[PDB]
Write a protein that binds this ligand. Structure first.
Ligand SMILES: CC(C)(C)NC(=O)[C@@H]1CN(Cc2cccnc2)CCN1C[C@@H](O)C[C@@H](Cc1ccccc1)C(=O)N[C@H]1c2ccccc2C[C@H]1O
Lengths: 99, 99
């Protein structure tokens, strides 16, 4: 579809069998989701945003559905105020920016 | 133009008669640039994101050219890791997400 930017670009995603609302963020290199208990082994990691760095848990090969579009990749889990879908996943569902 | 997301969506902006590089960021509500001098009066403000809150200077009705397209709006300047063009300006140039 086509999403305008008058409002935050929120979409419904499905991960770990759960449905959530995430922001489509062309500015995020990675995907960061709110704290949740995903199964599997993970690696500790530090990611930086506008106000500094936060510690996150990196999970690989996680299937995720973004607004009815299948994708699979790395997802970082940490104390983030909102779920962020980054370029790593946006590229998979053929998402582009137009103007 | 149509921009893919395999690489960071960077563009050249012109402001104050100066050239700079910035990121098209749909996850950012506002536009924030690295510290620099902008004519006019500014008011102290604070914005937050991943990592936390930072202190910025707010300049209103600043003219800025984004990859050839003109916009006039609020520009924030402060200790940002990178220049970010937020939704306030993306909407002015008719930017949308497509997939
Ligand atoms: C991988 C990760 C997700 C951690 N990336 C980012 O946060 C990058 C960081 N870089 C920097 C970087 C840092 C370290 C290394 N390389 C690059 C600068 C740009 N952001 C992208 C931002 O789009 C993220 C959003 C997240 C958010 C949305 C709503 C509410 C809270 C948090 C963000 O920071 N948004 C805020 C925002 C941003 C700009 C202007 C105004 C506002 C307000 C607010 O919407």
């Amino acid at each position: 579809p086509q999403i305008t930017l008058w409002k935050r670009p929120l979409v419904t995603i499905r991960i770990g069998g759960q449905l959530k609302e995430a922001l489509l963020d062309t500015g995020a290199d990675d995907t960061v989701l709110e704290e949740m208990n995903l199964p599997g082994r993970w690696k500790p990691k530090m990611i930086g945003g506008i106000g500094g760095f936060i510690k996150v848990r990196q999970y690989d090969q996680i299937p995720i559905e973004i607004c009815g579009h299948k994708a699979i990749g790395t997802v970082l889990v940490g104390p983030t105020p909102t779920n962020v879908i980054g370029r790593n996943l946006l590229t998979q569902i053929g998402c582009t920016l137009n103007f």
